[PDB]
Design a binder for these strands. Structure first.
Lengths: 218, 88, 129
RNA sequence: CGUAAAGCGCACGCAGGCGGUUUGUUAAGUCAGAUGUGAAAUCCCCGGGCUCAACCUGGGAACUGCAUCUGAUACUGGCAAGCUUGAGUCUCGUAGAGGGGGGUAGAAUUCCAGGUGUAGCGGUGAAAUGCGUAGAGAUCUGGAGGAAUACCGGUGGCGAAGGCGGCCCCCUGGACGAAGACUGACGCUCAGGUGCGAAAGCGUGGGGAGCAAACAGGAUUAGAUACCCUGGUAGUCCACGCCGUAAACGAUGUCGACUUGGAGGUUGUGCCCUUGAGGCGUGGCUUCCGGAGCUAACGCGUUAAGUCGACCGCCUGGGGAGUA
């Protein structure tokens, strides 16, 4: 009924007809999502998502827009799980191979950074290398300790992060998306009709998801 | 097209009553009235090829209705074309 | 103008299956209710319902098995331009038996299985595949 | 069959093809069975004989047909009766460069007559031909004449298409909307046929300001039968007749049905505090972008090139040739 306190839907513009089953849709030119449809959808997503979270799986939160950061870092990192909060690189799932060696360079350069030879031989090249750790750290941030390609995917906007959904559909990974009325249920296996760009809504929303992830068999 | 008083007069002459304004004899008689009036208009002008296209629609439509009423009731056909002075 | 209301019905069902439509309304007639009863009987539609008094309206609740649609390809065979009347031996099977062909026989509107069993051919209306 | 070849330039319409919906009758088409016939050989099947095979041969099947009789009556047709959701009529309005005839108005160009005035004007990339001390050009006044109608003017409107642009009158065609009434399938397409059909052109008679094929001169150029310049006749304009075509093009035939959306434009209208630059709906036509789908791709995309139905037109390698 009301777990979803304050969002009630959005996006007057570029609404998508495939979101027609999920729309109540009245006020002031903007569309209202039927949250009486959202609550069973979102409880199902918590059901199967807790089901794979208890099988000791990896979840990969996806939070590129603002302010999904650092809310996806806070929610993924509140669990022992993984995240993408800056620009999601085109192909970090479907060629994870090449992204594996970029993650390897991030590990070798942080080990080289805070412990080994960082002041060695140059100041300028050392500054160059440290800002390579800023670039590789904010792009390959959460995923750097994954070591596999994950068992599920939880995206926070379906149209803004269509690339990641397209790849997780390409690879047979269950996509869990909070769609808005502009988005499209592409290959999102567990759609949730919600609000993608309200920080109250995504902190409530990721709060529930991060709450149900960190219950395994324990 | 035609005057309101003229159309009312022809509906009163050919219909079962007034308000019977879509019967086949009535439509035929209204088309006939307008065809003759525009004989007067197109004797002059003669290069009003647009208005004439409207006139040939009236002629063709009258013809269709006479064919209908001929193959429904022939007594109504003979009384009708007898009264309107058409068919030559 | 409308000159084949049966092909219009089958068009309504193809374009309703293609648009994930829940149900399909159209003007109704005896032949459309006969065909619709064959389609419900053979499992291609969920239900039909004829309403109205002076202007009847047939309504077909369509079927969808998975996300996919049940009526895979419905075709009109005996169109008005060229009518097709088969005997009980010439009477075709569609998708090698996995898909009925609605034939109007003198005993009524039947399928190909039912009319080949009844021992009488007729006018083959539509392939439902 | 948008762009590869292929949608008549557009319509009206006869013969033709097709035809909403309900009931009754018929049973012509359709279906089922029966009978007569469909020569024999040949093909096919199961056997038999030549040592086998080819070959020969026994029996069947087949000969997909036609005729007659017996039935069935769902669909199509015939006949009779209806019914309104197709088509049409009436009432009231709306918008419009729809058409034809007549009149008028204002700017401007040219010409003519006159005043002022004086050495150039015009033209070009530059020039020259041309006009000009017989007074041009500039400027003011008066007049004549012809054609076109700035601004509004807008992927705006109307028309079947060609096309239609000052304002006013007369005659006239269509469309659309609102509520109600009436007819009751009267419908759709259309070979031959008939009509309309830009521009150029042709005939007869007018008109002739501007513009301008031809033509002439000046340049440019290697040449320049061109582009540029200066003139300039047919023609363009009117009346009547002919022609009968265009990249006559959305290179997309007509009519009807169904199939996610968004932003506009234009023209109706209903409802609701109008309490804005109101809100909410419902039609008609139209523009741009896009979804599924289709497509060789490009793109089309509820105005389809999607999903179907009816009828028409046309295509079949390039050239020769749309020619003889």
């Amino acid at each position: 009924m009301l777990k979803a306190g304050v969002h009630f839907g959005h996006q007057t513009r570029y609404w998508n007809p495939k979101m027609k089953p999920f729309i109540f849709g009245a006020r002031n030119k903007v569309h209202i999502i039927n949250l009486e449809k959202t609550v069973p959808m979102f409880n199902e997503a918590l059901a199967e998502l807790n089901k794979i979270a208890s099988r000791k799986g990896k979840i990969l939160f996806v939070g590129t827009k603002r302010a999904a950061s650092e809310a996806v870092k806070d929610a993924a990192l509140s669990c022992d799980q993984f995240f993408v909060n800056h620009r999601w690189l085109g192909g970090m799932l479907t060629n994870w191979k090449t992204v594996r060696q970029s993650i390897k360079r991030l590990k070798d350069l942080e080990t080289q950074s805070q412990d080994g030879t960082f002041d060695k031989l140059t100041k300028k090249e050392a500054l160059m290398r440290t800002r390579e750790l800023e670039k590789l750290e904010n792009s390959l941030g959460g995923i750097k300790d994954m070591g596999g390609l994950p068992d599920a995917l939880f995206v926070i906007d379906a149209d803004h992060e269509h690339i990641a959904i397209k790849e997780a559909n390409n690879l047979g990974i269950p996509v869990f998306a909070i769609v808005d009325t502009n988005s499209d249920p592409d290959g999102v296996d567990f759609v949730i009709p919600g609000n993608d760009d309200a920080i109250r809504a995504v902190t409530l929303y990721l709060g529930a998801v991060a709450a149900t992830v960190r219950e395994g068999r324990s | 097209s035609l005057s309101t008083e003229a159309t009312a007069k022809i509906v009163s002459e050919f219909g079962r009553d007034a308000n019977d304004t879509g019967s086949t004899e009535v439509q035929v008689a209204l088309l006939t009235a307008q065809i003759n009036h525009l004989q007067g208009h197109f004797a002059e002008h003669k290069k009003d090829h647009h208005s004439r296209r409207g006139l040939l629609r009236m002629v063709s439509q009258r013809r269709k209705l006479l064919d209908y009423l001929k193959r429904k009731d022939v007594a109504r056909y003979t009384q009708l074309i007898e009264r309107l002075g058409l068919r030559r | 103008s409308m000159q084949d209301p049966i092909a219009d019905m089958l068009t309504r069902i193809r374009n309703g299956q293609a648009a994930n439509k829940a149900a399909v309304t159209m003007p109704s007639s005896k032949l459309k209710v006969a065909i619709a009863n064959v389609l419900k009987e053979e499992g291609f539609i969920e239900d039909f319902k004829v309403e109205g008094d002076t202007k009847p309206e047939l309504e077909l609740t369509l079927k969808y098995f998975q996300g996919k649609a049940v009526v895979e390809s419905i075709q009109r065979v005996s169109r008005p331009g060229l009518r097709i009347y088969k005997r009980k031996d010439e009477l075709p099977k569609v998708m090698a038996g996995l898909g009925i062909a609605v034939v109007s026989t003198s005993k009524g509107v039947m399928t190909d299985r039912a009319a080949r069993q009844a021992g009488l051919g007729g006018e083959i209306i539509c392939y439902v595949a």
